[PDB]
Amino acid sequence: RIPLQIVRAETELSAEEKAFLNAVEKGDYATVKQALQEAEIYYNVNINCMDPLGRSALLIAIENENLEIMELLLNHSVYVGDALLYAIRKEVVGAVELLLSYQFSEFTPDITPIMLAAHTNNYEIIKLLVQKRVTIPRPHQIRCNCVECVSSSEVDSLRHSRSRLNIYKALASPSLIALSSEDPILTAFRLGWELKELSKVENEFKAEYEELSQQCKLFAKDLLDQARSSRELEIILNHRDDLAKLKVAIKYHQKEFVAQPNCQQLLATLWYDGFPGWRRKHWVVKLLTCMTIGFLFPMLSIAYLISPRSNLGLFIKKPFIKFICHTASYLTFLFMLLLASQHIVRTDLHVQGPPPTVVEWMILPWVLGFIWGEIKEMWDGGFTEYIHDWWNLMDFAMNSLYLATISLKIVAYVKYNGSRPREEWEMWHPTLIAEALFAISNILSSLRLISLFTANSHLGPLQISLGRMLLDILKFLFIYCLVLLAFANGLNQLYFYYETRAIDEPNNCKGIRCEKQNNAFSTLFETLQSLFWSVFGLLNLYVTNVKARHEFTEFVGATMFGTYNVISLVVLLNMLIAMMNNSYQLIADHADIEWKFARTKLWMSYFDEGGTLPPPFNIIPDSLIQNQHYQEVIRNLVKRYVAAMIRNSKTHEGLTEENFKELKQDISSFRYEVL
Amino acid sequence: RIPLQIVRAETELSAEEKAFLNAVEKGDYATVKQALQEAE
Ligand SMILES: CC(C)CCC[C@@H](C)[C@H]1CC[C@H]2[C@@H]3CC=C4C[C@@H](OC(=O)CCC(=O)O)CC[C@]4(C)[C@H]3CC[C@]12C
Numbered sequence: 062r063i064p065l066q067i068v069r070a071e072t073e074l075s076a077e078e079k080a081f082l083n084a085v086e087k088g089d090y091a092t093v094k095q096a097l098q099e100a101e102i103y104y105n106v107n108i109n110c111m112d113p114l115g116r117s118a119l120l121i122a123i124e125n126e127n128l129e130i131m132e133l134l135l136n137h138s139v140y141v142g143d144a145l146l147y148a149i150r151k152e153v154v155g156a157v158e159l160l161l162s163y164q165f166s167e168f169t170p171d172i173t174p175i176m177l178a179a180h181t182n183n184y185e186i187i188k189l190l191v192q193k194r195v196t197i198p199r200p201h202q203i204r205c206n207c208v209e210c211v212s213s214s215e216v217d218s219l220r221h222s223r224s225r226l227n228i229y230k231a232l233a234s235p236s237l238i239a240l241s242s243e244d245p246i247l248t249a250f251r252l253g254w255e256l257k258e259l260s261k262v263e264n265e266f267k268a269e270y271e272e273l274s275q276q277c278k279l280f281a282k283d284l285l286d287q288a289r290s291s292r293e294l295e296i297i298l299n300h301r302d303d304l305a306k307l308k309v310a311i312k313y314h315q316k317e318f319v320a321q322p323n324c325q326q327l328l329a330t331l332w333y334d335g336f337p338g339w340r341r342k343h344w345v346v347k348l349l350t351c352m353t354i355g356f357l358f359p360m361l362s363i364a365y366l367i368s369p370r371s372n373l374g375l376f377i378k379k380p381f382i383k384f385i386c387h388t389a390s391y392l393t394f395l396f397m398l399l400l401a402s403q404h405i406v407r408t409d410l411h412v413q414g415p416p417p418t419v420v421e422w423m424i425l426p427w428v429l430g431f432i433w434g435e436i437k438e439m440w441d442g443g444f445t446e447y448i449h450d451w452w453n454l455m456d457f458a459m460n461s462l463y464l465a466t467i468s469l470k471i472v473a474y475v476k477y478n479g480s481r482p483r484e485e486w487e488m489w490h491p492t493l494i495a496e497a498l499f500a501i502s503n504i505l506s507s508l509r510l511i512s513l514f515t516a517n518s519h520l521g522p523l524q525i526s527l528g529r530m531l532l533d534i535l536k537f538l539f540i541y542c543l544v545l546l547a548f549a550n551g552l553n554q555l556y557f558y559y560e561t562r563a564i565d566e567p568n569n570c571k572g573i574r575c576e577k578q579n580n581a582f583s584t585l586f587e588t589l590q591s592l593f594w595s596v597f598g599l600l601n602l603y604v605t606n607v608k609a610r611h612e613f614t615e616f617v618g619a620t621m622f623g624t625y626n627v628i629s630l631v632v633l634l635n636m637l638i639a640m641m642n643n644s645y646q647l648i649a650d651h652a653d654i655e656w657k658f659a660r661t662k663l664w665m666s667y668f669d670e671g672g673t674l675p676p677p678f679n680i681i682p683d684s685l686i687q688n689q690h691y692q693e694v695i696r697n698l699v700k701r702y703v704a705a706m707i708r709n710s711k712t713h714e715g716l717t718e719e720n721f722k723e724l725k726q727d728i729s730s731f732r733y734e735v736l
Numbered sequence: 737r738i739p740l741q742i743v744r745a746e747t748e749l750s751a752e753e754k755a756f757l758n759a760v761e762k763g764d765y766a767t768v769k770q771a772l773q774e775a776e
């Protein structure tokens with residue numbers, strides 16, 4: 062028996078106010094008029110009476126979209142505050158125009174009429190409001206130590222965050238950008254960048270800021286989509302405040318703008334400069350032409366040096382031929398790196414400091430060219446973006462290992478004279494370190510070729526997904542390294558008392574890299590190595606067996622080894638499978654825009670004159686007219702976009718409501734004509 | 737304090753054209769006819 066009563070009692074109005082509110086809601090030109098006259102004379106009705114469910118007389122008159130009752134209430138001095146916002150949110154032009162011609166609320170007090178109009182994204186209401194000289198407060202910069210931001214955040218943090226989000230939502234509407242900004246493309250780019258960088262700062266309101274940034278990027282792409290000619294697209298892309306706006310969009314990570322089909326057409330025509338209709342030809346003749354131009358890599362580079370402006374000197378200046386020549390030079394470098402480890406060119410293996418062979422003497426200009434190119438990349442173009450590549454770390458590692466190999470070879474040549482057999486050299490002979498670093502640099506140089514996958518149409522998205530899933534490999538190795546450190550600590554602590562010597566063990570071998578694996582858990586480094594190698598099954602089971610008859614210690618060690626194997630394989634590897642499968646499933650939707658953005662970024666790196674020579678040969682010693690043309694193009698694009706959007710806003714629901722309103726008005730007019 | 741004005745100003749028609757366009761949009765056999773006669 063649960064008793065049910067209204068615990069929050071609302072003060073109900075008198076019966077005289079109910080008649081006035083019912084006359085307002087039903088709609089009557091005479092009953093409301095005489096009710097207001099009686100309220101003026103006898104004071105029977107409070108004019109500012111309000112329903113318990115947040116509905117004043119003016120709000121109900123707005124909800125009925127009738128202008129006569131609204132005009133009479135406006136002339137009868139009804140409380141008009143917080144009533145234009147309801148008409149704006151209802152999105153009716155006549156009521157907003159009438160209220161602009163002159164307690165409880167459903168809107169937060171920081172909302173202005175222009176802000177709500179921008180939130181609702183109605184073109185006519187926003188235009189009619191901005192004609193009345195309205196302004197929006199400027200949101201502050203993200204990192205503020207000023208008093209006006211810090212004190213406001215300290216006093217009322219929720220109101221501050223709500224006000225900032227409301228302002229940024231008002232500024233990000235496509236209609237307000239199309240009306241109030243003279244450069245909607247650059248405004249959309251900048252607002253998308255600020256909203257994306259601000260979503261990470263305000264990590265709790267991340268979804269709304271990410272949605273607003275996506276809205277701005279979509280508006281920029283849709284504004285570019287309305288181009289009806291190649292001249293308009295060339296004017297858009299070349300506008301400088303060669304392809305300036307495309308470089309700006311690449312800077313602001315506008316992947317949807319970059320991967321637009323007409324931008325990709327213009328980039329493809331600029332890429333195949335010397336080949337009219339490269340996509341037209343057969344794949345066999347394309348492969349033959351690519352092979353010929355690649356095999357002509359000593360050519361077209363000497364000709365550039367001896368005659369830059371000849372018939373043949375301008376052949377390498379085209380971007381595709383430049384890319385082919387660079388790829389051919391790198392493949393030749395890797396071929397000589399393969400040849401450097403062969404018996405035909407490498408002899409006299411028992412000298413402490415050897416002079417370089419012919420293959421290494423040929424390798425040296427390539428290494429100097431790579432070093433000089435990476436040095437020039439630090440200066441030319443800039444330094445703040447050189448580290449913002451994530452491929453230049455690999456190049457820096459390659460060049461550092463090359464420099465270390467050269468310096469160690471020089472030291473071993475100048476301080477070691479004579480010959481000595483290789484078995485009696487010391488552990489840290491400079492020659493051995495040089496041969497190790499050269500091999501590591503060979504691995505890095507041959508793995509550098511993955512960056513060329515974005516040019517191909519089939520290996521590009523594959524490398525994009527490879528990066529996507531390496532981002533989760535990086536997360537998985539933290540848990541794996543914690544588990545590895547835990548079990549290594551435990552196993553070394555259990556097993557370090559039974560450490561033997563290399564002399565006692567057979568073949569003078571102490572470690573897990575022997576025929577009979579010895580001292581697998583004796584030291585912490587060897588324990589880490591053993592627990593790493595047990596993942597691939599290369600650690601045998603008898604390494605947990607000690608010389609003495611300590612069967613309890615052996616059993617506890619084998620149990621630790623089995624628990625580590627279970628945790629590190631059965632749980633963790635299949636967890637990694639599930640993680641990368643989920644990440645691949647998410648990225649497979651947006652996998653072609655990313656590849657097209659990466660291919661575009663690779664294409665614009667070959668457009669400029671800098672770095673024309675391959676690394677073998679790169680070490681051998683009025684604005685008003687453009688602004689007005691861009692302004693006409695923006696005017697046409699904005700008009701086309703606003704027309705397409707304004708009738709794409711026509712909806713079955715709104716059309717149906719409009720038809721009922723027109724039918725009701727016409728029936729009432731006909732009834733008044735008959736009566 | 738971000739100022740908001742229409743940067744791409746459209747040449748608005750005269751008030752006489754607004755009456756003709758409103759008569760066309762609302763639907764009137766007589767108002768559009770007399771408007772066209774006055775335009776002639
Ligand atoms: C499977 C083994 C034998 C590979 C050995 C390494 C190289 C011989 C391969 C690996 C990556 C390959 C590259 C992968 C992608 C491309 C881009 C591709 O570009 C185009 O098709 C041109 C048109 C465009 O840019 O879209 C031309 C071949 C090339 C350089 C490939 C040339 C041959 C490379 C260097």
Ligand SMILES: [Ca+2]
Pocket residue numbers: 435438452453456
């Ligand atoms: Ca580089």
Ligand SMILES: [Zn+2]
Pocket residue numbers: 201202205206207209210
């Ligand atoms: Zn501030």
